[PDB]
C-alpha cells in the first residue's frame, strides 16, 4: 500500500507538505516550490503521518 | 500470601473441591512454584478447549505437565482430527484419546500410538506452533 509522509523543506523554513509513497519504496527526496523562500527547493521525508 | 492465592485460584477461579485441591497439591507440587495466570490458563485449556472435567484433571496429573507440551500435543492431535472439543451437549463424534495417552506417554509413543505420524512432521508442527504463539503475543 501507500503511506502519507511529511516532506519538510530543506531550505530551513518550517514549510512542510504531505505526499504519498509506497511503504516499500525508499525515503523520498523531492523538489517542490517553497512559498516562504519563493523558490523551488529540496524537501526530505521526515516522518510517516499515516498509512493508506 | 503466595500459597493462599494459589489455593484461592484453584478453588474460586477453578471450582476445584477442597479434597480435589488437596490432592492436586499432593500430586503436583510444581503447581505452587508455577505462577498465577499461567496456572489458570492451563486449567481453562484443559476445561474448555480439551473438555476435561475436574475429576479427570485431578485423577490424571494434568497440571504437572508444561503448557508448552500440552498445547503442542493437543493442538497437533486436534488439527490432525484425532482430538475434538466436546460440544455443548458434551458429546464427540469419536471418543477422544485419554489424557494419559496424550501427556504421560513419551513423545515417540504419543506420535506412534495416538497421532500416528512422523517425528519430522511433529518437529515442523512444534516450530510452527511456537512461531504462531510468538506472533500472537
Amino acid at each position: 500500500k501507500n503511506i502519507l509522509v511529511r516532506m519538510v523543506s530543506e531550505a530551513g523554513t518550517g514549510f512542510c507538505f504531505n505526499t504519498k509513497r509506497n511503504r516499500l519504496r525508499e525515503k523520498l527526496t523531492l523538489l517542490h516550490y517553497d512559498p516562504v523562500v519563493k523558490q523551488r527547493v529540496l524537501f526530505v521525508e521526515k516522518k510517516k503521518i499515516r498509512s493508506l | 500470601q503466595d500459597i493462599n492465592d494459589t489455593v484461592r485460584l484453584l478453588k474460586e477461579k477453578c471450582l476445584f473441591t477442597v479434597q480435589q485441591v488437596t490432592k492436586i497439591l499432593h500430586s503436583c507440587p510444581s503447581v505452587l512454584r508455577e505462577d498465577l495466570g499461567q496456572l489458570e490458563y492451563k486449567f481453562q485449556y484443559a476445561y474448555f478447549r480439551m473438555g476435561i472435567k475436574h475429576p479427570d484433571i485431578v485423577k490424571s496429573e494434568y497440571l504437572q505437565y508444561s503448557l508448552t507440551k500440552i498445547k503442542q500435543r493437543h493442538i497437533y492431535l486436534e488439527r490432525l482430527g484425532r482430538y475434538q472439543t466436546p460440544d455443548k451437549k458434551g458429546q464427540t463424534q469419536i471418543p477422544n484419546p485419554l489424557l494419559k495417552d496424550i501427556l504421560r506417554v513419551s513423545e515417540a509413543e504419543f506420535l506412534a500410538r495416538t497421532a500416528c505420524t512422523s517425528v519430522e512432521e511433529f518437529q515442523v508442527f512444534k516450530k510452527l506452533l511456537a512461531r504462531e504463539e510468538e506472533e500472537s503475543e
Binding site: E10, A11, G12, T13, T29, L31, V37, V41, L42 | -
Partner: protein, 41 residues
Amino acid sequence: QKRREREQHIAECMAKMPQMIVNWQQQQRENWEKAQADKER
C-alpha cells in the same frame, strides 16, 4: 533575535541549496544510468 536566527538559517540553507539540488539530480541520473547498465548486463 528569533527573526535574525531564522533569517541566517535560511541564508545558510539557501547558500547550500544549489549544490544540494545539483548533487541530488546527479544522483538520480547516475542511478538511472546504473539501471540501464544492469539492463545491458
